Swiss-Prot record, chain B:
Keywords: Acetylation, ATP-binding, Hydrogen ion transport, Ion transport, Membrane, Nucleotide-binding, Transport, Vacuole. Transmembrane segments: none annotated. GO terms for cellular component: fungal-type vacuole membrane; Golgi membrane; proton-transporting V-type ATPase complex; vacuolar proton-transporting V-type ATPase complex; vacuolar proton-transporting V-type ATPase, V1 domain. Belongs to the V-ATPase C subunit family. It is found in: Vacuole membrane. V-ATPase is a heteromultimeric enzyme composed of a peripheral catalytic V1 complex (components A to H) attached to an integral membrane V0 proton pore complex (components: a, c, c', c'', d, e, f and VOA1). Interacts directly with VMA4. The gene is VMA5. Present with 21114 molecules/cell in log phase SD medium. This is V-type proton ATPase subunit C. The chain holds residues 169 to 392 of 392 of the full protein. Subunit of the V1 complex of vacuolar(H+)-ATPase (V-ATPase), a multisubunit enzyme composed of a peripheral complex (V1) that hydrolyzes ATP and a membrane integral complex (V0) that translocates protons. V-ATPase is responsible for acidifying and maintaining the pH of intracellular compartments. Subunit C is necessary for the assembly of the catalytic sector of the enzyme and is likely to have a specific function in its catalytic activity. Reversibly leaves the enzyme after glucose depletion, causing the catalytic subcomplex V1 to detach from the V0 section. It is a peripheral membrane protein. One of its GO terms (molecular function) is proton-transporting ATPase activity, rotational mechanism. GO terms for biological process: endosomal lumen acidification; Golgi lumen acidification; proton transmembrane transport; vacuolar acidification.
UniProtKB/Swiss-Prot annotation, chain C:
The keyword Mitochondrion applies. GO terms for cellular component: cytoplasm; mitochondrion; nucleus. It comes from the Eukaryota. Involved in protection from oxidative damage. The chain holds residues 63 to 272 of 273 of the full protein. Present with 1560 molecules/cell in log phase SD medium. It comes from Saccharomyces cerevisiae (strain ATCC 204508 / S288c). This is Oxidation resistance protein 1. Induction: Up-regulated by heat and oxidative stress.
Curated annotation (Swiss-Prot), chain D:
Residues 7-19 are annotated as: Interaction with VMA5. It is found in: Vacuole membrane. The gene is VMA4. Present with 16134 molecules/cell in log phase SD medium. Homodimer. V-ATPase is a heteromultimeric enzyme composed of a peripheral catalytic V1 complex (components A to H) attached to an integral membrane V0 proton pore complex (components: a, c, c', c'', d, e, f and VOA1). Interacts with VMA5; the interaction is direct. Interacts with VMA10; the interaction is direct. Interacts with RAV1 and RAV2 components of the RAVE complex, which are essential for the stability and assembly of V-ATPase. Belongs to the V-ATPase E subunit family. Residues 18-37 are annotated as: Interaction with VMA10. Changing S1A: Reduces ATPase activity by 11%. It comes from Saccharomyces cerevisiae (strain ATCC 204508 / S288c). Residues 14-44 form a coiled coil. The modification N-acetylserine is found at S1. It comes from the Eukaryota. This is V-type proton ATPase subunit E. Disulfide bonds: none annotated.
Length: 52, 200, 181, 58
């Protein structure tokens, strides 16, 4: 029989889909986090300059 | 044979591997005697070939149709190795409809072999009419020009047709030339005077 | 035993029954291959005679045995026309360019015809100002203006035809189509 | 015999395991590359935007 070896292959494909989703989501979250980090850094610099 | 010919109604999707990018299944035809040998040698024709996959799909009077589950890349390698091994793998695809289109093509062939035959009949008969008319017109012009060349000023030619059915065409030609060769001239008895044949 | 057309989304075209009926009378070897082509029309090609002549290019190299059919509707829906074997285009006044096998007709839901006769060969004519069919004593058998607005039809020796138009002596045009076969 | 097998019945599963293993390995490799690019972007566009902002606001 060959079906015995297709369930595991389907599970491998499913976890491949899950890990690509995870990787893309992590990339997007890192983009958002970098934008927020730059925003707060420029906020700090701006408050410094305007207080000066 | 079933394997070489279309397997439109023979093989079913379960014999294949669907919606899996890295896995597939081919259709194999095994000769009468090479059942066990191939069954113990089908996995060795390519790498990443899912072992323990042999399964009977169909058979004919000289072959038994098997199948092998293997990767997309290995299909070509297995097929070429089998072909060089005096072994014929089957050919098919997951059309899901080829059965009906192929029979419809056969029916269209059956309809056209009737229709085109009649149309060819009609065009051929009208051609045999008009082309033949032009053929007689051309020969009429031929006789006119030949009479003009060989004879003198005014047209008073007696253009006649004589048909000699039984095996007496050359004899009639001889009768005409010998009895009327002088018409073209004493030293011009090539034919003496104008005369032409229609091999109908 | 069937015919096809090639118009393009306009108000009025010709009917398939009419073409099936007319198919009866024309030289053989032409009725056999039956795929009619709309070479020119009045609706989607303007209303200029020059446009008509330009559209109908005497392109006979592919098939010099091609029938040309002109169908015209008079003022009061009286349909009629004629069949020609040569493309229409202005020529030198030397001679009428026309084979002695053309004919006229008065069609309707009641077909008729007037095959060419050997009495003469008149008014198979084509010029930049008019395009008329067989004639003789009295005006032409068929006539269309340079402007495609009025027409004249009368009996002629070239065809011995009757009067085709509902308004016999003269009339006006309301729609014209031309077909190539 | 309902099982046309020329070898032992568990080498099928061993090759199965190797197959899913390389699938997992390639998945991990692509995921790690995605993570690395997501890390380096984190810094490069952050630096670009903070630099140009700081400059114009200065």
């Amino acid at each position: 029989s060959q079906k015995n070896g297709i369930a595991t292959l389907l599970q491998a494909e499913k976890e491949a889909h899950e890990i690509v989703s995870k990787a893309r989501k992590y990339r997007q979250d890192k983009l958002k986090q970098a934008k927020t980090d730059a925003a707060k850094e420029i906020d700090s610099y701006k408050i410094q300059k305007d207080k000066e | 044979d079933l394997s070489v010919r279309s397997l439109h109604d023979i093989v079913k999707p379960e014999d294949f591997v669907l919606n899996s990018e890295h896995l597939t299944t081919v259709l194999v035809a095994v000769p009468k005697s090479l059942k066990s040998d191939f069954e113990k040698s089908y996995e060795t024709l390519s790498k990443n070939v899912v072992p323990a996959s042999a399964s009977v799909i169909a058979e004919d009077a000289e072959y038994v149709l098997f199948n092998v589950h293997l990767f997309k890349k290995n299909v070509q390698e297995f097929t070429t190795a089998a072909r060089e091994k005096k072994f014929i793998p089957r050919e098919f695809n997951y059309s899901e409809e080829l059965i009906d289109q192929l029979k419809k093509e056969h029916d269209s062939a059956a309809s056209l072999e009737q229709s085109l035959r009649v149309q060819l009949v009609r065009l051929a008969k009208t051609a045999y009419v008009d082309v033949f008319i032009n053929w007689f017109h051309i020969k009429a012009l031929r006789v006119y020009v030949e009479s003009v060349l060989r004879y003198g000023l005014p047209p008073h030619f007696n253009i006649k047709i004589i048909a000699v059915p039984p095996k007496n065409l050359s004899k009639c030609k001889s009768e005409l030339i010998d009895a009327f060769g002088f018409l073209g001239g004493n030293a011009f008895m090539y034919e003496p005077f104008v005369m032409y044949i229609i091999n109908l | 035993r069937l015919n096809g057309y090639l118009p393009s989304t306009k108000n009025k075209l010709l009917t398939p029954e009419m073409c099936d009926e007319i198919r009866t009378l024309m030289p053989t070897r032409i009725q056999l291959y039956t795929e009619w082509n709309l070479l020119y029309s009045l609706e989607q090609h303007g209303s200029s005679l020059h446009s008509l002549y330009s559209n109908v290019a005497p392109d006979s190299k592919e098939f010099r045995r091609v029938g040309y059919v002109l169908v015209i509707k008079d003022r009061k829906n009286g349909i009629f026309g004629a069949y020609s074997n040569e493309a229409f285009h202005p020529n030198e006044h030397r001679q009428y360019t026309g084979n002695g096998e053309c004919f006229l007709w008065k069609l309707d839901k009641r077909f008729s015809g007037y095959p060419y006769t050997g009495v003469n060969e008149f008014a198979i004519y084509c010029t930049s100002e008019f395009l008329s069919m067989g004639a003789g004593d009295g005006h032409y058998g068929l006539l269309c203006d340079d402007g495609l607005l009025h027409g004249v039809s009368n009996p002629c020796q070239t065809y011995g035809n009757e009067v085709l138009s509902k308004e016999g002596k003269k009339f006006s045009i309301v729609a014209l189509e031309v077909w190539r076969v | 015999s309902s099982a046309i097998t020329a070898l032992t019945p568990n080498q099928v599963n061993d090759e199965l395991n190797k197959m899913q293993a390389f699938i997992r390995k390639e998945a991990e490799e692509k995921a790690k590359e995605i993570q690395l690019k997501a890390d380096q972007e984190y810094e490069i566009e952050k630096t670009n935007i903070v630099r140009n902002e700081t400059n114009n606001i200065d």
